[PDB]
Design an enzyme around this catalytic site. Structure first.
Site, PDB file in Angstrom:
ATOM      1  N   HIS A  72      -6.373 -26.347  35.513  1.00  0.00           N
ATOM      2  CA  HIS A  72      -5.463 -25.258  35.861  1.00  0.00           C
ATOM      3  C   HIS A  72      -6.162 -23.907  35.769  1.00  0.00           C
ATOM      4  CE1 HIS A  72      -2.060 -22.812  36.426  1.00  0.00           C
ATOM      5  NE2 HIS A  72      -1.149 -23.524  35.786  1.00  0.00           N
ATOM      6  N   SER A  98       2.240 -20.032  39.198  1.00  0.00           N
ATOM      7  CA  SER A  98       0.979 -19.951  38.476  1.00  0.00           C
ATOM      8  C   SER A  98      -0.212 -19.782  39.409  1.00  0.00           C
ATOM      9  CB  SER A  98       0.783 -21.206  37.626  1.00  0.00           C
ATOM     10  OG  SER A  98       0.333 -22.288  38.425  1.00  0.00           O
TER      11      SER A  98
END
Length: 279
Positions: free
Chosen positions: A69, A224
């Site tokens: 991520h 995100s």
């Protein structure tokens, strides 16, 4: 400069219209700016970072991005191919473990760390922080972002992926930071993208191609992944001298593409990040 066959999100923030595939940007590319990616870490050895990425703080047994991520978002900020500010410095703060989770105390500590560590760095063009994380409302997580912002860091945070009002989410609901929502390649609000008055700007967030761990690439969707678009733009615009950390969110909002998004609920701003670059 121009990047042909860029990721659609890159092409979108240099275009008034959806569906293009070329990313136009000033060649300065955010050189001299710094963006702290507060996430799972950064695989700083990924060739797409070209040594412009380094870990500066971890809150776990390793500084390694064992998740991807954080490497993905750092890629959208400043990776060579998949990044908005292709010359900026990326600093990794690992507040999320390799499962993408993390306690509030550790996310506050990482925000408090950036506000100090920036005084240890060479960022003449200013400092940005991309927070591709979120949780339930917290006044103490909110205030930490406000402190990081007040300290002189452009703070970009995801609105959250709950298809709800972001005012129930943190750091999303903190007024003084740049809350970022997700759009998609057809200029729709992302099906998951949080909305509300607290949102300041939208960014590409659906099917964002960026770096991944193991030197690979991956496409994932989320507010995100819209946040690093706005962080990168912030660093970009700050390197150009067009804005500063304190007013970068307002400037991106003023210079956005207004009214281009579909399914924007009433009361939510209809603004898409846009570098307004004129070749």
């Amino acid at each position: 400069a121009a990047q042909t066959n860029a990721p659609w999100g890159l092409a979108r923030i240099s275009s008034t219209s959806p569906g293009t595939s070329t990313y136009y940007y000033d060649e300065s590319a955010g050189q001299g700016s710094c963006v702290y990616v507060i996430d799972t870490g950064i695989e700083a050895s990924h060739p797409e970072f070209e040594g412009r990425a380094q870990m500066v703080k971890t809150y776990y047994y390793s500084s390694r991005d064992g998740n991807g991520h954080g490497t993905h978002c750092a890629g959208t900020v400043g990776s060579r191919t998949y990044g908005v500010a292709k010359k900026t410095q990326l600093f990794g703060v690992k507040v999320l473990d390799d499962n993408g989770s993390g306690q509030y105390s550790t996310i506050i500590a990482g925000m408090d760390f950036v506000a100090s560590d920036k005084n240890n760095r060479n960022c003449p063009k200013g400092v940005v922080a991309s927070l591709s994380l979120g949780g339930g409302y917290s006044s103490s997580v909110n205030s930490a972002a406000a402190r990081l912002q007040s300290s002189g860091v452009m703070v970009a945070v995801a609105a959250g992926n709950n298809n709800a009002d972001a005012r129930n989410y943190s750091p999303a609901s903190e007024p003084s930071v740049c809350t970022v929502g997700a759009s998609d390649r057809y200029d729709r609000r992302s099906s998951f993208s949080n909305y509300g008055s607290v949102l300041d700007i939208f960014g590409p967030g659906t099917s964002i191609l960026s770096t991944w761990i193991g030197g690979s690439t991956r496409s994932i969707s989320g507010t995100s992944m819209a946040t690093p678009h706005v962080a990168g733009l912030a660093a970009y615009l700050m390197t150009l001298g067009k804005t500063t950390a304190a007013s970068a969110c307002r400037y991106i909002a003023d210079t956005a593409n207004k009214g281009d998004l579909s399914n924007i609920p009433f009361g939510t701003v209809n603004l898409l990040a846009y570098n307004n670059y004129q070749a």
